[PDB]
Structures are given as structure tokens and as C-alpha cells.
């Protein structure tokens, strides 16, 4: 016989299917880590050497996308043994996360981009997909070559750039270095084909969107660019990042904080208060702080049973509604052409498998592929 499997043939069958938005029992031709086919009952033998996969069942969703990790580690708030460690393959593919955006968080000192940068391409080789933000809390940021724009131009895997304000551990930026920071960021990202968006972490400050909403005026940069994440870290906050996503902008909201505004209690008001859900999007800030991801898996859960939102529609936030942000194509939706990022989950959304470009990450709810030091 001729030898096929070089194409990495697989057909995930007989699983209902929410690529987010609700397809039936649809089956999912793989090849060559490409989404090559979905359309209802499709051959076991339509391909060569197919692996082929009985979902019967099962629920078939995209990855998890999930744009705030501290990669490489982060904290140090509170000394150097306050430094939490760098971010484990399995962790991450067993909380059903497919594509990863790291960054750093206040400690700049003792973790640099270059080290980020070193732990996003490890990433890719083991299997997953990972992107960085450059800069930190600090403004204006330490970058890898020199300028934001440059880094967002240039750096391959650096999609935009991070920063801190409305916080008590900023660096006390000024409307003027935010807002050439931002601008930046943003003809970066028309030259390098990055989303070149701008993420502001939020602190407790009174002044909340303030100093974003000054941006606006001092510059021309698109509200498109603008994400504050941690919005519900704070209700007076949290209404203004309502009132801010209903003016065109998107808001990020950590499933690591449970108060005054839980994650699902979230992305709820945000539904109440009349926001597509397209503007919505959920970030774990894993290994910050230890955080953890399993916050985002069960902020799904908790959506489609203590809250009515429906499977689709509870996944968007942490699907189509990222990539569609990020402009990460082929991602967060299940599509011919579109990565093979899939997760089979239970009728109760309880991850079992995880694919990740093709290649299976979890079998039993247990990463079967690991980082060459776990
Ligand atoms: N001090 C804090 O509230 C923690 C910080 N917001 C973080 O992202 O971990
Ligand atoms: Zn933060
Ligand atoms: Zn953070």
C-alpha cells in the first residue's frame, strides 16, 4: 500500500457541534492540522489513512482563547518569593485552552520580553498557539527593540502592547505618553499585520476609564484598540466598561475575580445592558496573583446553567469574540480553513479531548502532551 499518513487524516463524527453558533450533529474532516471539511455525515473513507473518531454524544466546540497570561511567570508584588513560576503545556490544554496571548504584569524588572517572547515560540512548538504583548504596568514600556511600534511592527509574535493605568503600581503615565504608546501600538500593527490594540490594566482608582476616554481626544486611535481588562474588578468600574463597550469599544473581564462582579455575573449585565456579545471578551490572568485556569471553563458552565445564556452563546466571549479582536485568523471558530483547535466536552461541558492544530493535547481530560520539563 501507499503511505497517507503524512496528511494526519481525522474525522471527529457524530458530535453536536457549536462552532460557536449551533450547528446540529456535524462531522469535522482534519488534515494537515487544517479544518478541511463540516458538513453533516461525512465518509469514513472519504480520505486515505483517516483516523477516524466516533463523538457520538459529545459536544464539538473551538479551543479556548485565552489573551492574558502571565507566561513566563509573574507577581513579585510582595518580594522575589512572590514571583510565581512560568506557565505549564498541560495546564493550559487541559483547561481547554487551544491559543494563548502572554504578557507581563508589574514585575519588569525581573522578567523581560525577550524571555516572553522565548516562552511563546516554545509554546508553539509543543503544539499550541501563542502571541505576546510587549511592555508592562510601565509606561513607557521596556520593549525588545526599542519602540512599541517597532516591536508590534516587526517581532513576529507581538500583536500589540500592554500597560497599566488607574492603578496604585503604574508608573503614573501621562495622557501624552498613553496615548503616543497606543498610537504605536497601532501603526505597529498596520505594518506588521497585527490586531496592534493596546490592553489597560485596571486598577481601583476612582478615575476608572478616565484616562482612556482622554486618550480619545488627544489622538485618533481607533476605540477599536482600546481593551481594558479587569473591569469587573470594581462595580463603579465595571459600569463605566458598559457604558464604554456600548460606545463601540470591547471590555475584558478575568474569570480570576469572583467580587463585586463574578465573571458570568459579567458577562451577563453586559447582555442586560445591551451589548453584543461580540464586544465581550474573558481572560483568566492565569499564573498571576497562584491564578489557575479552570475559572474559564467553569464561567461557560455556570453561564449556560445558574445564568440562561445559551452553549453558543457562552462560548463566544471566549471564542469568536477574542479572535475576532485580535483579528487572530483561523482561530475560535470551525470553519473549512480555520485551525483544527477543537474540544469534545460532555453533554455537561466537561472537557474530555483537546485537539490543538490537529494534534491531540488531552485524552482523558489529561494532557497526553506535555512541555519537555513537566
Ligand atoms: N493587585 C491586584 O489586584 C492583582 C492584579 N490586578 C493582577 O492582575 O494580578
Ligand atoms: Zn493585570
Ligand atoms: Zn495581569
Known amino acids: 500500500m501507499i503511505d497517507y499518513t503524512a496528511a494526519g487524516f481525522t474525522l471527529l463524527q457524530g458530535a453536536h457541534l457549536y462552532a460557536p453558533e449551533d450547528r446540529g450533529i456535524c462531522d469535522v ?3 494537515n492540522g487544517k479544518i478541511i471539511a463540516v458538513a453533516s455525515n461525512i465518509p469514513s473513507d472519504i480520505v486515505p489513512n483517516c483516523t477516524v473518531v466516533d463523538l457520538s454524544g459529545q459536544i464539538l466546540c473551538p479551543g479556548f482563547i485565552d489573551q492574558h497570561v502571565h507566561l513566563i511567570g509573574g507577581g513579585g508584588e510582595a518580594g522575589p518569593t512572590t514571583r510565581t513560576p512560568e506557565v505549564a503545556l498541560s495546564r493550559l490544554t487541559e483547561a481547554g485552552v487551544t491559543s494563548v496571548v502572554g504578557l507581563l504584569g508589574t514585575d519588569s524588572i525581573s522578567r523581560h520580553p525577550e524571555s516572553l517572547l522565548a516562552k511563546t515560540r516554545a509554546l508553539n512548538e509543543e503544539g499550541i498557539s501563542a502571541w505576546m504583548l510587549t511592555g ?3 509606561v513607557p514600556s521596556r520593549t525588545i527593540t526599542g519602540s512599541v511600534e517597532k516591536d508590534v511592527a516587526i517581532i513576529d509574535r507581538v500583536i500589540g502592547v500592554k500597560c497599566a493605568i488607574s492603578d496604585h503600581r503604574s508608573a503614573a503615565p501621562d495622557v501624552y505618553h498613553l496615548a503616543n ?3 504605536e501600538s497601532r501603526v505597529g500593527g498596520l505594518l506588521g499585520g497585527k490586531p496592534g490594540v493596546t490592553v489597560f490594566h485596571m486598577g481601583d482608582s476612582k478615575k476608572a476609564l478616565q484616562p482612556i476616554y482622554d486618550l480619545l481626544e488627544n489622538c485618533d486611535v481607533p ?25 463601540g469599544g470591547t471590555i475584558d473581564i478575568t474569570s480570576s475575580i469572583d467580587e463585586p462582579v463574578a465573571p458570568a455575573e459579567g458577562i451577563a449585565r453586559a447582555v442586560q445592558a445591551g451589548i453584543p456579545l461580540a464586544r465581550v471578551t474573558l481572560s483568566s490572568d492565569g499564573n498571576g496573583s497562584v491564578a489557575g485556569f479552570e475559572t474559564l471553563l467553569e464561567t461557560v458552565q455556570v453561564l449556560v446553567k445558574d445564568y440562561d ?4 452563546d457562552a462560548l463566544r466571549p471566549l471564542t469568536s469574540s477574542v479572535a475576532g479582536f485580535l483579528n487572530l ?12 483547535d477543537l474540544l469534545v466536552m460532555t453533554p455537561e461541558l466537561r472537557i474530555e479531548q483537546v485537539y490543538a492544530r490537529g494534534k491531540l493535547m488531552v485524552k482523558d481530560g489529561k494532557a497526553c502532551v506535555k512541555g519537555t520539563f513537566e
Open 29 to 31: 474532516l482534519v488534515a
Open 136 to 138: 508592562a504596568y510601565h
Open 181 to 183: 504608546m497606543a498610537a
Open 223 to 247: 476605540i477599536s484598540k482600546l481593551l481594558p481588562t479587569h473591569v469587573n474588578r470594581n462595580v463603579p468600574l465595571f459600569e463605566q466598561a458598559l457604558e464604554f463597550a456600548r460606545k
Open 309 to 312: 445564556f445559551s452553549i453558543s
Open 329 to 340: 485568523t483561523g482561530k475560535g471558530e470551525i470553519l473549512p480553513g480555520n485551525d483544527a
